Amino acid sequence: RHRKVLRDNIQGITKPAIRRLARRGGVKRISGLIYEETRGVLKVFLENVIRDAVTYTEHAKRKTVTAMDVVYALKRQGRTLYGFGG
Amino acid sequence: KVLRDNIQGITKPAIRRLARRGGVKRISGLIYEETRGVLKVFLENVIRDAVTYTEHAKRKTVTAMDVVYALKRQGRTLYGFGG
Amino acid sequence: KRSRKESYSIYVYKVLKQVHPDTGISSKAMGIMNSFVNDIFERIAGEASRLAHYNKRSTITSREIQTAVRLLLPGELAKHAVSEGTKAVTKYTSAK
Amino acid sequence: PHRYRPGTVALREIRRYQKSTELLIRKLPFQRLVREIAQDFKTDLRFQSSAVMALQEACEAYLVGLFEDTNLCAIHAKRVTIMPKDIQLARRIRGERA
Amino acid sequence: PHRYRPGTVALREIRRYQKSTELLIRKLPFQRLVREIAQDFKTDLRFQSSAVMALQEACEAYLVGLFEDTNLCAIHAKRVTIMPKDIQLARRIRGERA
Amino acid sequence: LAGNAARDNKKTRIIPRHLQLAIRNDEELNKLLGRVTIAQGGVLPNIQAVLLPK
DNA sequence: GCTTTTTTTTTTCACAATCCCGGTGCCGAGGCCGCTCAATTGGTCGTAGACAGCTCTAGCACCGCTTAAACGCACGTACGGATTCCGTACGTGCGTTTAAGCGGTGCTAGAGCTGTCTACGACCAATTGAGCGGCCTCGGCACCGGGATTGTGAAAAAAAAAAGCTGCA
DNA sequence: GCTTTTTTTTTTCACAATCCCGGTGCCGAGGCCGCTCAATTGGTCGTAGACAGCTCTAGCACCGCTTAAACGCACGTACGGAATC
Ligand SMILES: [Ca+2]
Ligand SMILES: [Ca+2]
Ligand SMILES: [Ca+2]
Ligand SMILES: [Ca+2]
Ligand SMILES: [Ca+2]
């Protein structure tokens, strides 16, 4: 339906951005091997959080993941999130 | 001595044995007190909740359930005492 | 006298004799199996309770249970768990 | 030609970003990555924009905090450079990972 | 005059205790601790026998588990000997103490 | 507490960051909201000792 | 090449731990007994939610210019880690001491169970105002530029610590 | 105990970065409005649980043996970590 299949967007999570997140965490010096390892971690976070949201969607029969889908999913992973409803 | 600090009843030998079952080889001397500290906070937290249960149920006898229910709240779910 | 406290034990025993008809079981072991069943029953019902609640529905149905189970058990175990809960309902419907 | 000593700018960045709260991942790259991953589980899905923002808030936070744990883990082994093994210990003690 | 080198009984003792399931803390001392600590929240409390054993399974379990994580931190600092700073780090990362 | 961190930041209305600073700097509130994430909140100024210059 | 040391390797002996035999006896899994209540049933009634149809939100695509950020490479410093080496905090194994453990008896607090009675909460319908969505405004706040202030780093020069170099005793 | 350098410390400017103000402008916090549907009133009925009374369970105290475990001390090896590169 008017083109939607996705590319390889994990490299979109650039070394600049991983470096900035490490900076917020008060990290001073970063090894070469962090950035790829970080993307693995990030991917596995997102895979788990979206699987569960996507479930809550498929149950309510929708084809549109709501913020509440993501909220309910995050509370499930013990990662309660404030300021998007619920 | 030998007087009313029951925490000390938790012997070095027994602390050694735990950390064994936990794959520990060589044990610093300072650790047996650190362990003792940590154990108390653990019991304080669990027992406070278990007795909070007890006082609500209007009883003077702490049940094994009261503990079970406490340990669930602390996220330390325990099987085989009434779960 | 002496209270009358229910438990899943007579069923834990029945399943055991399906999977291993000559092996037995201790009271501490049967206490862990009773702790195990009650634990997950509360897990699956609570996640169904909420599912239903999030979708403004009054009834927990077998569908809520099956969505709760995708959520609670890990991939390969959810798969058999659905497969068995589906099959049991089909068989139950089929009978009457 | 003036040149800042290695660490002096890292330390500035560290103060720059701790003071702030704006999201640190580029919003479209992240959005494309949400959508890509979601295909695995169901095709031709729409996301509310708030659902995608809620996901980048929950992600950045999860990593930013893992990087704290990870930094302690570097320092615990008398280092200053966080290494893969640092994350892995952080995650193994958290119990995110066998 | 037979003399086993440092750490060689340790390993025996590890293999030994990991094979077994029996409480490692002496039951009476433990119990005397449980009543000492219970007082600070309510006086003249009675305990079911099984309440104390529920408390002692739970304690050792926690301690054993914490020691695994402690060992891991100590090995992470290229060391063999666990020390308080190992416990404290594993607790910092468990989110047990700030 | 939010409003004090609001005032201390030299602003009239409370925003996420004020709430966060108020929650994380307060011992008990932070325990109560220990496994809770505040969106557009950020982190408390914290830099480990050994990471500083000599 | 030789001899002369450290280090590495191999070989031999000591000792726990396991597994194979022989056994016994205790205690609770197991299963039967005899009562009871919780599962089952067909009936009746009300509304949850399937469904289908309707509205219109908001999610998705596409474009083209602007410029902030990512990108990749040159350059060198401080970091990580290997190696060495020293002091002692730990582990091991003795003999001496301690109190847990066990089995038992005796007392009673208090857990829990039964029946009675009514204060309190569900439920209902009628009543109405608190709080919903809508919509309009003007002041806080985001962004900017310019000037003041703070902190870093190099370069020059000092203060000192440490190193390499002495004769003596 | 020196004479001769490296190591560490100090002081002097140059320069970048961050800080703080007022000015400017846009938009969403705040609030008023008018209408709604959910909270309130006042009523009824039924039962959940408080309560007194009695049962007997299992928790506590105590005691007197028999060890197994804790204890304290001698001794030294392998470890932690300082120092160098
Ligand atoms: Ca035999
Ligand atoms: Ca030393
Ligand atoms: Ca009573
Ligand atoms: Ca409004
Ligand atoms: Ca206003």
Q: Which token pair is C66?
A: 């099956």
The whole-angstrom separation of Cα F2 and Cα C68 is: 38
Partners of chain C (3+ Cβ pairs below 8 A): A, B
Number of domains in chain B: 1
Q: At what angle do helices B64-73 and E49-76 cross, to 10 degrees?
A: 30
Q: Which residues in chain D have Cβ-Cβ distances shorter than 8 Å to A21?
A: 24-25, 60, 63-64, 67
| Rounded Cα gap, residues F39 and F30, in angstroms | 15
**Between A and F, how many residue pairs show a Cβ–Cβ distance under 8 A?**
28
Which chain A residues are closer than 8 Å to F48 by Cβ? Answer: 26
What determination technique applies here?
X-ray
Which strand (E) or helix (H) includes residue D78? Answer: none
Distance between CA atoms of residues E62 and C64, nearest Å: 35
Residues 6+ apart with CB under 8 A from F22: F1, F2, F4, F5, F29
Between the CA of C54 and the centroid of ligand 4 the distance, in Å, is 26
C-alpha distance from residue E71 to each of C88, D75, E79, E85 (Å): 47, 17, 9, 11
For D48-86, letters b (16+ CB in 10 Å) and e give bebbbbbbbbbbbbbbbbbbbbbbbbbbbbebbebbbbb
With beta carbons under 8 A apart, name residues in chain E contacting F34: 95
Where is chain F broken, named by the residue before each break, C–N > 2.5 Å?
A: none
The DSSP 8-state label assigned to residue F50 in this structure reads G
Residue E67, Cβ neighbours under 10 Å: how many? 25
Chains D and E touch (3+ CB pairs under 8 A): yes
Separation of CA E64 and ligand 2 centre (Å): 28
3-class DSSP state of F38? strand
Whether the CB-CB separation of A67 and D48 falls below 8 Å is answered with: yes
Whether the Cβ atoms of residue C72 and residue C47 lie closer than 8 Å to each other: yes
Residues of F in contact with D71 (CB under 8 A): 48
CB F45 within 8 A of CB D15: yes
Chains F and C touch (3+ CB pairs under 8 A): no
Establish how many alpha carbons lie within 13 A of residue B4's alpha carbon, considering only the half-sphere containing its beta carbon: 1
Q: Which residue in the block uniquely carries the two structure tokens 């099984």? A: E50
Measured torsion, CA atoms of residues C51, C54, C57, C60, in degrees rounded to the nearest 10:
20
Say how far apart CA E71 and CA E90 lie, in whole Å.
9
Whole-number Å distance, alpha carbon F12 to ligand 4 midpoint, is 20
**What H or E segment, with its residue span, contains residue E36?**
helix E27-39
Resolution of the deposited coordinates, in angstroms? Answer: 3.2
Confirm if D60 and A21 have CB atoms less than 8 A apart.
yes
| Through-space separation of residue F9 CA and nucleotide H23 C1' in angstroms | 21
| Count of beta carbons in the 10 Å neighbourhood of residue D25 | 22
Please answer yes or no on whether E46 and B63 come within 8 Å at the CB atom: no
d(CA B61, CA D75): 48
How far is the C-alpha of A18 from the C-alpha of D24, rounded, in Å?
Answer: 8
- Residues ≥6 apart with Cβ < 8 Å to B78: B67, B68, B71, B72, C35, E54, E57, E58, E61
| DSSP E strand stretches across D1-98 | 46-47, 81-82
A46/C59 Cα distance (integer angstroms): 31
E84 touches strand H (CB under 7 A): no
Domain that holds residue A33: 1-86
Cα(A37)–Cα(E5) distance, integer angstroms: 41
Residues 1-54, chain F, touching D (beta carbon < 8 A): 16-17, 20, 37, 39-48, 50-53
Q: Is B27 helix (H, G, I), strand (E, B) or coil?
A: strand
Beta bridge partners of A81: F37
Nearest C-alpha neighbor of B43 from the set D59, D14, E36? E36
C35 touches chain B (CB under 8 A): yes
Distance between CA B54 and CA F17 in Å, rounded? 41
CA of A69 to C1' of G150 (A): 49
Chain A residues with beta carbon closer than 8 angstroms to that of C54: 56, 60, 68, 72
Residues E48/B64, Cβ–Cβ less than 8 Å: yes
- Give me the sign of the Cα torsion angle D38, D39, D45, D47: positive
* Contact at CB, C67 and A59, closer than 8 angstroms: yes
Q: Is A42 on the interface with F (CB under 8 A)?
A: no
Q: Where are the domains of chain E?
A: 1-98
Residue E22 CA to residue E20 CA, distance in Å, equals 6
**Interface probe, candidates D28, D70, D96, D97, chain A, greatest A C-beta count within 10 A:** D70
Residue of F nearest to A77 (CA): F35
Residue burial C42-69, b: 16+ Cβ < 10 Å; e: rest: eebeebbebbbebeeeeebeeebbbbbb
